[PDB]
Design a protein around this ligand. Structure first.
Ligand SMILES: O=C(O)c1cccc(N2CCCC2=O)c1
Lengths: 336, 333
């Protein structure tokens, strides 16, 4: 009937042929013009409206024709796809931000757009632009009354996703706008925990100098311990040069960091394991003396027991197999 | 003192056979049994002249040290390979390790023990499998090196080659009856090593040669180890055989998809859902699942127990990563 025409207006919008879009919509009743601009055509795992697809693909001319000459609500939600990650309940603003379509962000926001739109997971345009990495958009959004405080259904601040993806500049920016770095998440992790495991030493720098607290996650691990389990030596080194619980927890990191340099088969080093392990054993016995309760010998680790004194560690130096078995026997005790 | 044994050493290490033949000529018989039997300590290593020469492929020195100066092959020493410090290594072991097939032939042709045991029981054949030079491995076997000799923890020559990914020598070993159902102290077989790595061509040979599916000391099949290590190729190749009707199949599929979100080196949440939904589709074809309690670490979320539940989180980046650890925390521990 007329449904086919709406598929034709979708094409012109999605593809960006403003010339075609005009020829389709002109000489039509306002009632019909709304049905055409507001029919959820589904293509390529993406349920969207002409405006939403024209803003996710980034066809500013079509966006203007749909906003400056035609009246769109700038609030039509759609199920959009981003690199496999599928997002539902997103408006053209969110899709534009995620795609870094700054020109559309100007057009959309300045032509009216809830800068604090909430997807079904509460993802505000700010989160999408942070998860992307375009600082240029982020500032314009917040400087146009966006809220850096609004999180997601699991309480993930825009800072947290910025730390994860490793966008140092935008991390500093949100911190400049007083984005509290001590907000927690459902897991229990803070933005520090994220940038730590991801080896984002640049972001860990701008975090500590901004009241970044040493919180503990739901896995009983400080940001340091996460970085240790994640073979990010640089962070562990820097985090040690701070308010690190001396001994008990300081040695545990080195005992963990080295162990991680074995359990990998992709970043393994083994020599970096003996180094980080023997170093700890020395400190655990530096003066006195902080001993270790070794778990009983198990089969998976060759009915072998963890070295408990510095001399034993020096004996397995000439034993490739034992240095491997050690890294995992140490890990089992530290992590569970 | 006799730092002259130090100059004699530098010649052998550097292969300067002319300097060496000069130092050693006009030496009394007692003087040559001292100079060559001397154990110099050079850079995290301890060796005799013959040990460092065969270690370094200086066959001009090895031939002089062998043909004209009757030297014992059995001279053991403490050699080093990329941080790994091996003790009790004879010159033959050092040649097979460093891939010096010329020096290997010289040492063997002159009667060196082709079955020497390192202080930790490394056979000269193990060094060659570690190194992958099929030329040496084939040569050592034809001169009666025993394939059965494994190290202090029963690491077959077939295993270390299956681990290091030398398909060409793995084939050769099993061609020489090398047992594919070996088993180490850690309970692993040669199949577990090849499955952890992405070594499909080796895993192919092992199941060509009817490798047995065993459970290592850690409660893992080669299928589970592969899925635990995000080696989906090996998982699907292995699943083209016999596994516990649904139960083991689903387990690997569940664990494989969960590891894709975990593995920060191969992150693919699209692949995670694909393998996780396929399990719930192969479950509810009934094999229900015993979900573990909601834990703070995982946002006090509970594992999806029905296909509809999984379908609900597909447009939810966060819950997909969270589900991953939740699935591993159950399947592995
Ligand atoms: O046989 C072993 O236990 C063993 C242990 C450590 C290193 C090595 N090798 C020999 C060849 C190259 C290399 O790293 C062998």
């Amino acid at each position: 009937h007329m449904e086919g025409l709406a598929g034709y207006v979708y094409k012109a919008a999605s593809e960006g042929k403003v010339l075609t879009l005009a020829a389709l919509l002109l000489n039509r009743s306002e009632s019909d013009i709304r049905y055409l601009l507001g029919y959820v055509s589904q293509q390529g795992g993406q349920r969207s409206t002409p405006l939403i697809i024209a803003a996710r693909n980034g066809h500013a001319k079509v966006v203007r024709l749909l906003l400056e000459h035609y009246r769109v609500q700038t609030q039509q939600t759609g199920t959009v796809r981003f690199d496999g990650y599928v997002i539902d309940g997103a408006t053209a603003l969110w899709c534009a931000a995620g795609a870094g379509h700054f020109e559309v962000v100007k057009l959309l926001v300045s032509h009216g757009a809830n800068v604090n739109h909430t997807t079904v997971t509460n993802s505000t345009p700010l989160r999408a632009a942070c998860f992307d990495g375009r600082l240029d958009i982020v500032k314009y959004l917040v400087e146009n009354n966006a809220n850096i405080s609004i999180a997601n259904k699991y309480d993930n601040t825009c800072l947290m996703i910025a730390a994860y993806k490793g966008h140092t500049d935008v991390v500093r920016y949100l911190l400049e706008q007083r984005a509290d770095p001590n907000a927690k998440a459902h897991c229990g992790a803070t933005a520090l925990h994220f940038a730590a495991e991801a080896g984002h030493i640049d972001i860990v720098k701008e975090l500590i100098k901004w009241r970044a607290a040493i919180v503990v996650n739901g896995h009983g691990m400080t940001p340091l311990k996460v970085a240790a389990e994640s073979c990010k030596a640089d962070v562990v080194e820097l985090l040690l040069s701070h308010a690190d619980c001396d001994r008990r927890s300081r040695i545990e990191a080195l005992e963990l960091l080295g162990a991680s340099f074995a359990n990998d088969r992709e970043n393994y080093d083994i020599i970096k394991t003996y180094h980080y392990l023997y170093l700890a054993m020395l400190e655990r016995f530096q003066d006195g003396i902080l001993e270790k309760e070794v778990l009983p010998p198990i089969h998976a680790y060759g009915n072998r027991t963890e070295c408990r004194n510095p001399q034993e560690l020096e004996s397995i130096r000439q034993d490739r197999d034992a240095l491997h078995m050690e890294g995992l026997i140490v890990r089992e005790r530290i992590l569970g």
